[PDB]
C-alpha cells in the first residue's frame, strides 16, 4: 500500500456547507475514499472551508486531480496533495548530453509543459548540466518531486521545485 500521505487531497476553498458526507460523495467519483473531513471549528462546527480526502491508491489521487476543476456544492474548490506550490522545477545531473526532447518526452507525461530551459553557460554557451521545466499546472510539479528517482537520457537526475 502505497504510503497513506501520499494518497491525501486537502481540498481548499470549500463552500461552508460542504460536509464531509457531500464531501465524501463527490470525490467517490474518482476512486474509494479511506478518509474525507471538512475542518470545523471544534466550538461552532461552522467549517473552516477546507478538508482533506485519502484515496485507496495514488492512481485514485492521480484521476481525482486529473478531473479538475471540481465543483463540489456549487464552488470551485482547490485540490492539493498533502505536503512533503509551483509550476517550474529544477532538474540537475543531466550533463552535457542532455537535449530538450529528453527533457520533454519526459515530463510531459507528467502534465503540460510550458517552456523548457535548458541552462547554458553565459561566457561559452556550454551547457551546465541542469535545466528548468514550467509546467501549465502546480500538480505536474507535485507528482514530479514526490518520486524518488528520475531517470532522464539514462542520467540519474536530481529535481526539485524552483521558484
Request: a neutral charge; proline letters at 2%.
Amino acid at each position: 500500500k502505497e504510503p497513506e500521505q501520499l494518497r491525501k487531497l486537502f481540498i481548499g476553498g470549500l463552500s461552508f456547507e460542504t460536509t464531509d458526507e457531500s464531501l465524501r460523495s463527490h470525490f467517490e467519483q474518482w476512486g474509494t475514499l479511506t478518509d474525507c473531513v471538512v475542518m470545523r471549528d471544534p466550538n461552532t462546527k461552522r467549517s473552516r472551508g477546507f478538508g482533506f480526502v485519502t484515496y485507496a491508491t495514488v492512481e485514485e489521487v492521480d484521476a481525482a486531480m486529473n478531473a479538475r476543476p471540481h465543483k463540489v456544492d456549487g464552488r470551485v474548490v482547490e485540490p492539493k496533495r498533502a505536503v512533503s506550490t509551483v509550476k517550474k522545477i529544477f532538474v540537475g545531473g543531466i550533463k552535457e548530453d542532455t537535449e530538450e526532447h529528453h527533457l520533454r518526452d519526459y515530463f510531459e507525461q507528467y502534465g503540460k509543459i510550458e517552456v523548457i530551459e535548458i541552462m547554458t553557460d553565459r561566457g561559452s554557451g556550454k551547457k551546465r548540466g541542469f535545466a528548468f521545466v514550467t509546467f501549465d499546472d502546480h500538480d505536474s510539479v507535485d507528482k514530479i518531486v514526490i518520486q524518488k528517482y528520475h531517470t532522464v537520457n539514462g542520467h540519474n537526475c536530481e529535481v526539485r521545485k524552483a521558484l
